[PDB]
Design an enzyme around this catalytic site. Structure first.
Site, PDB file in Angstrom:
ATOM      1  N   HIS A 106       0.811  -1.227   0.000  1.00 21.25           N
ATOM      2  CA  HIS A 106       0.000   0.000   0.000  1.00 21.25           C
ATOM      3  C   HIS A 106       0.847   1.281   0.000  1.00 21.25           C
ATOM      4  O   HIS A 106       0.345   2.374   0.270  1.00 21.25           O
ATOM      5  CB  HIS A 106      -1.005   0.004   1.162  1.00 21.25           C
ATOM      6  CG  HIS A 106      -1.684  -1.311   1.376  1.00 21.25           C
ATOM      7  ND1 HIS A 106      -1.172  -2.275   2.216  1.00 21.25           N
ATOM      8  CD2 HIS A 106      -2.816  -1.832   0.849  1.00 21.25           C
ATOM      9  CE1 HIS A 106      -1.966  -3.332   2.204  1.00 21.25           C
ATOM     10  NE2 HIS A 106      -2.972  -3.088   1.381  1.00 21.25           N
TER      11      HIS A 106
HETATM   12  S1  FES Z   1       1.897  -0.446   3.186  1.00 20.43           S
HETATM   13 FE1  FES Z   1       0.293  -1.878   3.691  1.00 20.43          FE
HETATM   14  S2  FES Z   1       1.386  -3.691   4.349  1.00 20.43           S
HETATM   15 FE2  FES Z   1       2.971  -2.214   3.922  1.00 20.43          FE
END
Ligand code: FES
Length: 141
Positions: A106
């Site tokens: 993410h």
């Molecule tokens: S940014 Fe979501 S698990 Fe690393």
């Protein structure tokens, strides 16, 4: 008897060794002079998470570069390779926008001391119980 003992005698500057401990990766990066300087250039006021997240020192310690490495010289950065958002493995080799790690799940960016700088992760990568027990070996646990 959980502790394990990692030979780091062959780890050159700019190399990360990844070892599995308690089922998860531990990153042992021998930092370059650029990594060290950049880590020490960050003001606490600039950080998302000002807590060192370091099992080896006071739980209220500030996330200064010095409180993020095992050694005074700052060459040895040892941390859980477990993104503090949802636990994906961050990608290293100086990745992301802050010269550290990038979590592609993410889009978390961690700096050269493993501190969270951008993206949905709330915390700096935590530092396990870890110490050198001689010149060449890090005990984890
Ligand atoms: S940014 Fe979501 S698990 Fe690393």
């Amino acid at each position: 008897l959980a502790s394990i003992f990692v030979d780091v005698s062959s780890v050159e500057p700019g190399v990360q060794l990844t070892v599995k401990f308690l089922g998860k990766p531990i990153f042992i990066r021998r930092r370059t002079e650029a990594d060290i300087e950049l880590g020490r250039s960050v003001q606490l006021g600039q950080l998302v998470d000002t807590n060192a997240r370091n099992a080896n020192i006071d739980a209220g310690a500030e996330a200064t570069d010095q409180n993020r490495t095992l050694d005074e010289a700052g060459e040895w950065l040892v941390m859980w390779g477990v993104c503090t958002h949802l636990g994906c493995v961050p990608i290293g080799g100086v990745s992301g926008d802050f010269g550290g790690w990038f979590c592609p799940c993410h889009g978390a960016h961690y700096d050269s001391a493993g501190r969270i700088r951008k993206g949905p992760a709330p915390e700096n990568l935590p530092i396990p119980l870890a110490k050198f027990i001689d010149e060449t070996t890090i005990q984890l646990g």
